[PDB]
Amino acid sequence: ISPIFQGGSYQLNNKSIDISSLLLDKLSGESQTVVMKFKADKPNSLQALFGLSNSKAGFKNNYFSIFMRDSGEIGVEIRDAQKGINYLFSRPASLWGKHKGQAVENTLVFVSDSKDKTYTMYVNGIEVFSETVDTFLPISNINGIDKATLGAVNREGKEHYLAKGSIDEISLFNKAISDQEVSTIPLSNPFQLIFQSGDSTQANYFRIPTLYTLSSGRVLSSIDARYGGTHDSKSKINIATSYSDDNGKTWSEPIFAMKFNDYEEQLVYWPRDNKLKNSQISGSASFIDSSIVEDKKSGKTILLADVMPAGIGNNNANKADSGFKEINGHYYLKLKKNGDNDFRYTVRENGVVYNETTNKPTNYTINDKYEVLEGGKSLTVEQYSVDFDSGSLRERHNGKQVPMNVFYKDSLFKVTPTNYIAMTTSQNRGESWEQFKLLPPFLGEKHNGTYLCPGQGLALGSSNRLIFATYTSGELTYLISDDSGQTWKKSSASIPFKNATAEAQMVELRDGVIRTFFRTTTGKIAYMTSRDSGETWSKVSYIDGIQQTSYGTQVSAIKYSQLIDGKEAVILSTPNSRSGRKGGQLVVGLVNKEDDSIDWKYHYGIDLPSYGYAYSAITELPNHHIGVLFEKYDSWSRNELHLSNVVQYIDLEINDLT
C-alpha cells in the first residue's frame, strides 16, 4: 500500500512540530504502521519522537507515543484512561547515535496489528520487541485524540518529552505490514551482523566476540552462541565461528567449533520480566569464552574455550578439583559411575575406562567425542528441550536419542563438576573443526581449571611460540606451546588481586617483547610486560586516561602494522566509563622506543558516551582497515539481559580514529 502520510526533514530542537492537519483525518481502521528515519546524536534523557494524543484537560493519560532514552532504549506507550489501558513496550540498547563522528540515520518500523492483536518494533532491521495482548488498543482509537506531534507528546496543552534530533523521513500506513514487507525497507546501518538470531546456530543470543586475521587474508570470528538467554554458564552455550574472505564485507553462515547435544538447539525468547528473567537452563553442559590463534608452522587454526559439565558454571564449579588424577607423572580424566558416591574411574590411553578400586580396565571406552562406548557400542541418552509453556522454565526429555557424553547429566559416567579448558583445531581455516580435546591441568590435582581470556591468543612473530592467556586467583597463567599446540606449559605471573576476572589480551610490541593488557577491580586497565617471549613477567602497571567500572570489562588490543605519526602503534578497545559498560572507544597509543612506554594519544568514540559497549574484538584487516566486533549493550546491567542482535561489526580506517 501507499502511505496515508509522508513527510521529511523535520528538525526537532526542543520544540514540537504539529502535523495534526496533515495526519489525523487520514488515519482509518484499527491497524497501522509507522516508518521513521531519524537521527539523535545528542538526545535528551527521555524524549518522544512521535505522538498521537488527546491534548485536552483531564485526559493527560490518553496518548500513543514512540519514545527513546539517552541509554539507546526505544519504546512505545499506548494509553487510554477510559479503557483502563496503559501499555508500555520497550527494549534497551536498540539505537545508534554516531558513527565516524556523523549522526546515524536509524530506521524504525512500528507495526500495530489489530487482527493478530500484536505490536512489533524494528530498529535498523532488527526486531526489538513483539508483544501480543488480550485487549488490543488501536493507536488511533484512543479516546479523544486531537493532536499528532513530532518531537513531543501534547498533554493538557503542554509539550512533554521534548526531543532533540531530526526526523528525516516519516510515513504512516493504514495497514499492519508483514515481516516480509518490513525486510524490504532500505536501511542506512553503520554496522553489520555476523551472527544473528535465526541463523544456523539457532541461538537467539550471542556474547563474547573474537576476531583474528589469518595469513590467507581470511578473517575469522568466534562467539558464544547462547541459548538460555544471555546468561553465563550454567546454561546451554555452544561456540560458533564465521569467516570473511572479503575484508569483512560478507560473512559465512556460522558453523560450530564446539558443541554439546544433551539439550536441543532452540531459539527461545527468554523472559525479560523481573520474576522470570533469572530463569536459567540448569541441566545442560556448555562451552564459554573462546579464543583463537593461527600457527605459522603447521598452518592450523587453534581455538580454545572453557568447558562446563551439565549444570555447572563459574558460580558452582568445584574450585578444589582439577577433575584429573595424577598417576606416575601423567594426568587422567576422572569419572563417576551411576550409583557410586566417589569417582572410582579414570580415562586412560586409547580412551579405556579404568577402575581405580580394582586397578583393571572395564568394557567401557571413551571415544574422540568424549562419548561412552560399551564393548565398542555407542550408548545414548535422551535429549532435553526447554519451554515456558507452564509459566516457568521447564527442562524435559524430548524423545530424541543422542550419543552419551561424559559431560552430560544423564550419562552413565560423569566428569568432575568443575571447569575445564578444551582446544580444537581447523586445517581449512574455519571451514570445519576437529573434535575438541581437554587440556591437562596446570596448577595441580586440586585446583580447578584456569579461565580462558576471550579474544586472541598470540603467535610470536620470530618463532613458532603460541601463547593463550588465562587467569585464576592471584595470577595470570599463560599457556605456552612451541609445537603447534600438541603440548602446553604454564607461565605464571602474579597479580595483586585475589579472585579477579583478569581477562587479558596480548600484543607483541617488538621481537620477544609482549605487553599484556588486563581488566582489574581498580577502575583502571592494567598491564605487564615480558621480554623473553613469555617466560618471565614484569610487575603490574596501570593506564591512566581510560576509566573502567569497579568490576571492569574485557579489553581487546592489537599492534597495528603501520606507523602512526612516525611511531609504532597499539590500539585498545574498551568501554571508557566509571559508571557502566558504555562509552565505547578505540584508544590509539604510540610506543616510546626508548622504554617501550605507550603514550595514549587518540581516543575514538565508537558511539555516544551513554550508549552500550561491553566485550569486544578488534583486528587489523588485510587492507589495513580495523574491524571491530562488539557487544553493543551494557552486558553487566540487569536491565539489559536477553537482548538479540546486539553483537555487531563495524569497519574503521585509521584516519577515522586520529
Kindly list the characteristics that best describe this protein.
658 residues, Jelly Rolls, Neuraminidase, eight-stranded antiparallel β-sheet, six-stranded antiparallel β-sheet, 3 helices, 2% helix
Number of strand elements? 52
How large a portion of the residues is in β-strands, by DSSP E? Answer: 35-45%
The separation of the N and C termini measures 47 Å
Radius of gyration: 27 Å
The CATH architecture name of the largest domain reads: 6 Propeller
Query: Briefly, what CATH class of the largest domain?
Result: Mainly Beta
Give the overall form.
Answer: globular
CATH topology of the largest domain: Neuraminidase
Assembly type of the chains comes to monomer
Number of folding domains? 3
Alpha-beta classification? mainly beta
Main beta sheet strand tally, sense and closure: 8 strands, antiparallel
Helix fraction bin = under 10%
Count helical runs. Answer: 3
PDB class: hydrolase
Keywords: hydrolase, drug design, neuraminidase
Assembly: monomeric
Entry title: Crystal structure of the K499G mutant of NanB sialidase from Streptococcus pneumoniae
Structural features, described:
With 658 residues, this protein is mainly beta. The protein has three domains: 1-190, Jelly Rolls; 191-319 and 418-658, Neuraminidase; 320-417, Intramolecular Trans-sialidase, Domain 3 (Intramolecular trans-sialidase, domain 3, Beta Barrel), CATH 2.40.220.10. The protein is 2% helix and 44% strand. It has three helices and 52 strands. The strands form twelve sheets. Strands 24, 25, 26, 27, 28, 29, 30 and 33 form an eight-stranded antiparallel beta sheet that branches. The protein has a six-stranded antiparallel beta sheet with strand order 1-16-3-10-11-12, with no helix packed on it. Strands 2-13-4-5-6-7 form a six-stranded antiparallel beta sheet. β42 (504-510) and β43 (513-518) form a beta hairpin. Substrate binds at residues 207, 519, 581. Its EC number is 3.2.1.18. It catalyses: Hydrolysis of alpha-(2->3)-, alpha-(2->6)-, alpha-(2->8)- glycosidic linkages of terminal sialic acid residues in oligosaccharides, glycoproteins, glycolipids, colominic acid and synthetic substrates. GO terms for molecular function: exo-alpha-sialidase activity. It is an enzyme of class 3 (hydrolase).
